[PDB]
Paper text:
The bifunctional enzyme Δ1-pyrroline-5-carboxylate synthase (P5CS) is vital to the synthesis of proline and ornithine, playing an essential role in human health and agriculture. The P5CS molecule contains two domains, GK and GPR, catalyzing the first and second steps in the biosynthesis of proline from glutamate. The GK domain catalyzes glutamate phosphorylation, and the GPR domain catalyzes the NADPH-dependent reduction of γ-glutamyl phosphate (G5P) to glutamate-γ-semialdehyde (GSA). Our results describe the assembly mechanism of P5CS filaments, in which the GK domain forms tetramer and the GPR domain forms dimer structure, and both domains form specific interaction interfaces.
In the P5CSGlu filament, no ligand binds to the GPR domain. Conformational comparison of unliganded, G5P-binding and NADP(H)-released states shows that the overall structures of the GPR domain are similar. The structure of the NADP(H)-release state, which has no bound ligand, is identical to the unliganded state. In our models, unliganded, G5P-binding and NADP(H)-released states represent as open conformation, and the NADP(H)-binding state represents as closed conformation. The interaction formed between F642-P644 of the contact loops in adjacent GPR domains, which appears as a CH/Pi interaction, is critical for the filamentation. In the P5CSGlu filament, the GK and GPR domains are likely in a stable conformational state, while vibration may occur in the GPR domain of P5CSGlu/ATPγS and P5CSMix filaments due to the binding of ligands.
Numbering used by the authors:
A (entry chain A), B (entry chain B): 347 to 776
């Protein structure tokens, strides 16, 4: 059925909960060994499914993305080994050690979350990565593919189930049928905790709209912003904008705006940046203030909160820093915002005023990739304002659970009737 | 209006965001000085509103709770001073310091959340506590009273606005009218972040049901459980159960069940515990297994997942530890579960198997009060499975915000084209 999936997943979570030292590490190690030693199967299956899906011709993104090569499998192998090696102290780690009275020691610890539900469009390289993340964060996990990558998905699922059955001995990983009336599966509760979308803009949008009363990690928009201050080296700003837009224009955190200090427009920097974008072939719009600025110029931007993905980038100009800050707050989706300058003052102003999910300074807006932060293998880009924000490592999958080991204590024994005191001496946390 | 409330609150949040060292501490200090020096006003106002609400006779809980005495104001004063003294490093604290390459140092920091919405039934002693929590966690804050405590609420709001206008100079605290079509205000979004209910079971229930697409802290049920193991001192279990149930039977974390090891039923402990509860006057039910156990016994429990609040407590009996664990998982709302014993083995079994919000061992289920954990002044009892679990201090009001201060770096400059490396050396976090 459908619900027995989630129930058995929860049972398997309770199962895996108690093996931490060197067991789940060896489990994900063996998953890597499977992924390197049994590559013929998934390879031929991906060949079959791509050849089949060619004739339907769904979309160039999907039909170009669901490919799979021995190089990508080598990449998955080394990534799984990485998770294995740096995933030794994720479950059971303590966060506090307090003493309240004689022989009563509080300590808050780490636990799984529960039954994660991963939702992605056909992308058969994710599946082992997210399964390794599950097995290293000890929580059970469901999955949900698409219409394509079906046979590849089933092959990889059999692979991960084999790799998991070695130690732990219980299969808490699953998969659901063709779209399984996604609204129905989503409306469920008491079973699943985190809808982790992974597909694309359309998918996360439909999710956040349909999902009611269940926490949904991930974002929906990627409207960056790149404020070029008045005390920034010119070619510096040039290369920053170039490397921000001209590397993965369809990515989730690529600049879809570029504000400029109105003072600096006098130094022909506008001409230079337009020349650069034109050399790179980008259809630029203009902003109402810039629209008013020059003679006839580029077309008028439809909406300032628009998302292009292709090679398009609005350009507006603001008088003062604080106006730029207000602009970013009003329009930007608080995802990823930068600033380039050589002044420390404006740097502190920005980095302490803006409320994005992550703010840079003279860096490039294409660093928010999780892997680059030295943050393991990231499982999403959280923009939600609770529990996770920016790139989420695996620690975006672990809550807390207060435990307490007294001897004989009681509740009102600490009132005037009983002679018990308070210390609150923070012990050395392990 | 209603929305301009939230917008101005957000502006005030951005305002207060940048004063941390000794300023907000002095602000909440001065709030305490107001609460101690201007007590006549709120006192007479509470007198008036209680005298008025007497004639309507709404409910004994409310009409007994909205009282207010100089002793309670002394309590609020010392609590606000406590928050002041231990609230010095809540905003701006760093959590990581990483180095990725030459002169590019990541660091994840602490921030407010946004526009908190506190919802409580008439309880005019909370208002200054939650306003102090706001002003010490730097985030703006709305409020929502009830039909009673109205004049008291307005008096205390004027008081807190005076105290806040000293430093910060912007009023980011508000209040809304009589129930303001709670569904309307709740349906809002893009403005408010945390519905923090504080009233009672009915209130949090109506909230969690009505609230769609907005994070809601707090719980809805308090079904504890007290498993008395087979190697526990008898009078120990006696006093543990007594102090668990017979201190605040209407509280949110008072035992509403008591499982016993079927082996220990042979030692007349059942007779003793029933005698104790009877001496304390508690209408006990029985559990299906206990129902089958004895001759005619106490009545049959209607539903095992019931909530009494008054002096009633089911009693069931389970054969083996693991069966007790499964029982707690199936029925209990994972709020607060204990275990009494003298065996270390079963202790580890329990404390590592059960997935409640907090698990004790030989302690009393009436410790989960926030204040007792050495956890400041608690703002709720989180049972939600994200961002907060168990008693939430003020740290349940602070997310993270990755910042990044490089010199000249770029995105594809770290591919094969540019000679830049990776270090990931975790610097000493401040």
């Amino acid at each position: 059925p459908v619900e027995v999936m989630a129930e058995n997943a929860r049972t398997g979570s309770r199962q895996m909960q108690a093996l931490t030292p060197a067991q789940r590490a060896s489990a994900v190690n063996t998953l890597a060994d499977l992924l390197v030693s049994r590559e013929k199967f998934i390879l031929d299956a991906n060949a079959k499914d791509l050849a089949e899906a060619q004739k339907s011709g769904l979309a160039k993104p999907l039909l170009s993305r669901l490919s799979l090569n021995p190089a990508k499998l080598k990449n998955l192998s080394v990534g799984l080994k990485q998770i294995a090696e740096d995933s030794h102290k994720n479950v059971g780690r303590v966060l506090r050690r307090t003493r309240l009275a004689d022989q009563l020691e509080l300590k808050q610890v780490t636990v799984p979350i529960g039954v994660l539900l991963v939702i992605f469009e056909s992308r058969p390289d994710s599946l082992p990565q997210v399964a390794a993340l599950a097995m290293a964060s000890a929580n059970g996990l469901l999955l949900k593919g698409g219409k394509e990558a079906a046979h590849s998905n089933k092959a990889l699922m059999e692979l991960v189930k084999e790799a998991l059955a070695t130690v732990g001995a219980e299969h808490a990983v699953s998969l659901v049928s063709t779209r399984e009336e996604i609204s129905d599966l989503l409306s469920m509760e008491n079973h699943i905790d985190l809808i982790i979308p992974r597909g694309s803009s359309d998918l996360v949008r439909s999710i956040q709209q349909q999902s009611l009363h269940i926490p949904v990690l991930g974002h929906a928009e990627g409207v960056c912003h790149v404020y070029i201050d008045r005390d920034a080296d010119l070619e510096k700003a040039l290369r920053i904008a170039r490397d921000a837009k001209c590397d993965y224009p369809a990515a989730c955190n690529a600049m879809e705006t570029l504000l400029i200090h109105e003072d600096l427009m006098s130094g022909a920097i506008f001409g230079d940046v337009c020349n650069m974008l034109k050399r790179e072939g980008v259809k630029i719009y203009a902003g109402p203030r810039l629209n008013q600025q020059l003679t006839f110029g580029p077309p008028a931007a439809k909406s300032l909160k628009h998302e292009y993905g292709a090679l398009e980038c609005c350009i507006e100009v603001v008088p003062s820093l604080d106006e730029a800050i207000n602009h970013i707050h009003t329009y930007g989706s608080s995802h990823t915002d930068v600033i380039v300058t050589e002044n420390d003052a404006a740097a502190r102003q920005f980095l302490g005023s803006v409320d994005s999910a992550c703010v840079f300074h003279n860096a490039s807006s294409r660093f928010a990739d999780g892997f680059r932060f030295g943050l393991g293998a990231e499982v999403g880009i959280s923009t939600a304002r609770i529990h996770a924000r920016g790139p989420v490592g695996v620690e975006g999958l672990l809550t807390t659970k207060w435990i307490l080991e007294g001897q004989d204590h009681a509740a009102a024994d600490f009132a005037e009737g009983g002679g018990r005191t308070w210390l609150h001496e923070t012990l050395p946390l392990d």
